[PDB]
Design a protein around this nucleic acid. Sequence first.
RNA 1: CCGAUAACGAACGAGACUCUGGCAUGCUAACUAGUUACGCGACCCCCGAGCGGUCGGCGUCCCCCAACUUCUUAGAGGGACAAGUGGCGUUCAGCCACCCGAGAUUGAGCAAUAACAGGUCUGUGAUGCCCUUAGAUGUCCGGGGCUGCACGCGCGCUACACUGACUGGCUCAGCGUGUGCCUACCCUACGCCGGCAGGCGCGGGUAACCCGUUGAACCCCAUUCGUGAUGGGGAUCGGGGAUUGCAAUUAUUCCCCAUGAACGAGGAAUUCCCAGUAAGUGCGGGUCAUAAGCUUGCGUUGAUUAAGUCCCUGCCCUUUGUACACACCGCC
Lengths: 75, 55, 143, 145, 104, 171, 144, 68, 189
Amino acid sequence: RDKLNNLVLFDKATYDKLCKEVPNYKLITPAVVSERLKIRGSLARAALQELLSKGLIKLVSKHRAQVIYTRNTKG
Amino acid sequence: GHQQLYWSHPRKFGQGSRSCRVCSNRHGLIRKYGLNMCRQCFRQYAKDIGFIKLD
Amino acid sequence: PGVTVKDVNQQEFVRALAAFLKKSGKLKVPEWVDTVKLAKHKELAPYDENWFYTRAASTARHLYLRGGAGVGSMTKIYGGRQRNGVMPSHFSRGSKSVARRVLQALEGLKMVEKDQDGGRKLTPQGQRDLDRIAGQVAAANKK
Amino acid sequence: MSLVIPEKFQHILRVLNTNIDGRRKIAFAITAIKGVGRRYAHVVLRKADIDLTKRAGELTEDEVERVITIMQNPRQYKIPDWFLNRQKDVKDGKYSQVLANGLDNKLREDLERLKKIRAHRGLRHFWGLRVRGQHTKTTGRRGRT
Amino acid sequence: AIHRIRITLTSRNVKSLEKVCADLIRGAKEKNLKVKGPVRMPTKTLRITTRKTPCGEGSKTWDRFQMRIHKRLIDLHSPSEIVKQITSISIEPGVEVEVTIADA
Amino acid sequence: MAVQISKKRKFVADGIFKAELNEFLTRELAEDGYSGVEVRVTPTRTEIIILATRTQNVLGEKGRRIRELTAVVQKRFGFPEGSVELYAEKVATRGLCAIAQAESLRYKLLGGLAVRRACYGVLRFIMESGAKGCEVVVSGKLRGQRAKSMKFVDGLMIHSGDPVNYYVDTA
Amino acid sequence: SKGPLQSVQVFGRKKTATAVAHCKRGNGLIKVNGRPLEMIEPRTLQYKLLEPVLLLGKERFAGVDIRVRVKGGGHVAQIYAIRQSISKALVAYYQKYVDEASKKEIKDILIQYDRTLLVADPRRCESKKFGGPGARARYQKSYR
Amino acid sequence: MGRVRTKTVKKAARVIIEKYYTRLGNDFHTNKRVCEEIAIIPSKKLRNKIAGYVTHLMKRIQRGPVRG
Amino acid sequence: DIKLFGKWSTDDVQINDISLQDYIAVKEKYAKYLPHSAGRYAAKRFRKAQCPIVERLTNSMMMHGRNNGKKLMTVRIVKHAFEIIHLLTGENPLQVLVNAIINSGPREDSTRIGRAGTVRRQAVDVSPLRRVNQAIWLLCTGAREAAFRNIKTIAECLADELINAAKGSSNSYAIKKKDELERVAKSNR
RNA sequence: CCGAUAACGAACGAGACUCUGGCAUGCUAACUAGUUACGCGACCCCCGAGCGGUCGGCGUCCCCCAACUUCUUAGAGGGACAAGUGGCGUUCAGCCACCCGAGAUUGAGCAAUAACAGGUCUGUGAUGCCCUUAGAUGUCCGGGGCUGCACGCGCGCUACACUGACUGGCUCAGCGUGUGCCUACCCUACGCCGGCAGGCGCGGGUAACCCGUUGAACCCCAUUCGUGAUGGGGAUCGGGGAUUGCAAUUAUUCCCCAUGAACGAGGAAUUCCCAGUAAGUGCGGGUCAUAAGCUUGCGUUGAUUAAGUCCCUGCCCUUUGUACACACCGCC
Ligand SMILES: [Mg+2]
Ligand SMILES: [Mg+2]
């Protein structure tokens, strides 16, 4: 616990992780994905809204201080 | 001295222009409502003026 | 089922009207809009490039809500908190020239006119513009 | 579009004489240069016509040099006369904006002119005391002990 | 006219102000003048907070002196003249009158 | 309107005039037992009444002193000529006037009477003129550096609450 | 069918904020300061605004037209004054124009949910004292 | 707490009960009205305190004797 | 039926412990559309017992100075946290909150004035109102401490605090503090 | 207060009292407050709504050309009393809870016998004695100083951050002031110029008549930032531009562009506080030609804990001891 130095732009090893497992667990928020994939958080918001527009992730809240998403239903 | 310096100071403002209307003091002046009375002279004459302590 | 401006979310209404003003391009925009700050108490210039269109929509909406407003009224409306550094905060007005330029652009759009007294009110042209924009944004909100 | 990092992405730049971190935004990244702050960075980017939402690291060489020449020549680029640091110079009278170690050497020049002419501000700077007339009785003790 | 008079009563003590208004309405009603009801203007409270001490030493106690000014409006609107009908004003100390015409 | 001053300043100024007139009359007619001043103000003229113990003294030979005071109060306050009238009225039950008894006590002590004698005489006069109670304090130095205060009471005497304002006369 | 003079006017207040609900005969429509109940800011506490109609029922409100003017306090006080005026307006309207059986069978629901819809909050403020910053807090004192 | 009565109300309550027992009754508002004319009480706030203690004492009297 | 925040029915939530049954206020009588009401709950003793516990939570979550009156902000924080826990666990947020209060409330404590050995001399068992008070306090303080210097927001930190407390997993601040306090009472029995 | 009872009956202080807040769809009223109703408009309407909706648009004391006081104002009257019920209590004084109720403890002001060698002679044409009184310790004028800085302490303000900062939009107050005897100095609308600070004309207001429907802040809703002394913090310092004043240097104040310091919740200790309270948060008055990080008030948002105890710190009462009585700062 000294510094985080989270990445500010995506790469090949993390973009595929975002596309493969982010729309698979129930609680997906920018903070959660940031602390899960070591992304900064501006990227978290941008990429989450990109997946939301692409349709793999469903928004629920849409609030300024906190925006909440979820994985799609199965079966 | 003579006429041209005895009261030549510009005194159109500041503490020095205003004075107590009672005791000619320049400190604690109450200029609200045109009182121009001292902080202490007002406590002396408030009953005569009409200011009553209600609360 | 007519729609007046007061029957819809004003936050989205002002945005839709700003888009309308942007798309119908005749509103005069001063060459320094990209440089000045909107208010004395503002540390940065606004992020949005079309802040002039946004502000024009906002002041038209406010003139609809209540007339007779001038530059002194507009600057009071758009004033806000000043932090004053280590000093405790106070209240500050906006930019008089910004408000006056916006209102001059509005009367150049010919939807704002001088009152019989001081200040300005809205022309029927501006009234019909605002209320039709309100109707379309209400339709968008409904569906 | 928030895709992967561009190939021509530099983690750290080197503009003028001091490096700047490109990982942050461009406007808040060029503020690391002395002499240019948030307002100047934003106005020169408005005059340079570059996507404000993009990071400084993904800037290309022509855009970077365009921003450099914008911020170096503001008088010829519509920038108002009241926005620069050295407006109406006490030395040559030309309005200018200083954005380098030139800022440091102009500061020492303006300090040493007062010191040479034995002005009160110069003496106070020489002694290391406060110069804007505030009370030194109970504050500023950290810089002394 | 045809004349209409506005008389304003101003004082410090409500008892005498109410007396000097009520007798005016009561007197004019017998003389059959159309009297609009006595309008009560909001009272003006002059508040002065001053240190009790005359020196400065103490527990920082303050005196809240209050001076209240009460104001009443009475309108007499008769079809005929009014000055000749009303020549007495029946004042008591403390209360001050001010005549005004409806033109003002 | 423009020439007229606001009501707040007007009432403050009227109170100021009352205070200054009362203080001047106190200093001038103190040796005649000046009790107080009552001022009836009309928009046309000003009527002032000096409530005193000795009218025959406050008005001089042929009313010289009272007309002299009328001229004085014209000149100081800028009253137009013939717009102010000074009347002198004898105070009823002077034994119940706090200011008058304090003045008589001052006169006695200046004469050099023992404070116990003078204060007890004042107590007796007040109670004889009829009061629920009274209380006098003489504080200061007589013949010695150390100051002493002597207090003389009798009857009922209330101190607290609203009723003291219109039940107790103080001087 | 066109019976006039069927309207009441009821106020409700909280913390120097007064709202006047003008309950008039007509089709169901509730507006505050010329705007519908929705889109009134803050959007939080919208349920607090709506609680009268949510509890007592839309059908009862269908026979009245509500216009409320409120000109005091701050935002939350405006909200509470508005909801109190709305809740008292139709119960007074019912008391005046229909039987009080309806009035009691609505006011018991309101009173068991929350007493503040029909009873104003009696607390306003407290004066500041000259020994401290607030009404009761005193300035910090030092001994050495 | 802090509802203990004072001599000023108790003396008056005893006296008016003794004087006007026949006129007075065990109803608070009736007592606060009869007091308005059987005594010149300067204050309403003290008048109704006296009336309350009067009702208490008369409710006691109906059962058993007291010091009054 | 009440529809707190338009949803999250109250009638399915049970308080399983009688020791806390008559102090938790999620029943139908105390059920309310919003966690906000100027109900004068501190007017007298035990008045807060009938105060709704979600209201108590949103009143305790406004602390540490910078935000003491911001009830609207605290209400929206409670809203977001409840939504998060509903989509994360799969049961009613009210039931989650009730179980969290039950597991957070320290069943005992210790208090004297004398020369304490480790923390405090005499063990003691706490009142149910103290259980609710200390549970709400511990949960709020845990969420506040969790969301101080990290990217994770207040709503998420409150959410995981309640989620961990509702089951008991040794990582919740409230559960850890309860464990420590029960241990010191056990040692100073 | 009740009771015991060589006491009985009282008085001051407490209470009572005055002011303030909370309720009166009850009274008196209001073109300097308005509200409904109605009439002209202006717009959305046209599907047609049509007693449709919005209007702080204009009006109906333009006195012949509506009523009414609910909202507002301010007067008189009311109302709350431990009054009703249950429980406890000598079944007394009273206490606890509940019902009906707006309210079942709203805040202040006033405030005893006395004491403090407490503070003020720098409030005074309050004042004894002493000092000085023409090279003045009088009085005036010019400049400086009251700010001066190795350091210690007190009241404070701003922060340490994402419960955030920035940007924009939406949206709500109440106290209260406002043109001057002397006295020179008012609050400001509206239009125009400038980016801002500001400047220039044209009014209104001596005031519920104008500022003003005080478009306050916090907050609410959207944007960006993303745990990084970092887009937190704005200290220090450079340059420039305005305002008041006779005069701005030792920077008066304000504005603009630059550097960006500690500070990552603070040791021992210690302060304040029980409901619209603490606290967050702005706005008035006083000071004022220019001036608020102060103070005095006001409003907004709005809690946690407690309905107890003498543990700590104090104070009071009783008993007790006393060689004290100028009273322990004593006597010796
Ligand atoms: Mg008392
Ligand atoms: Mg700088």
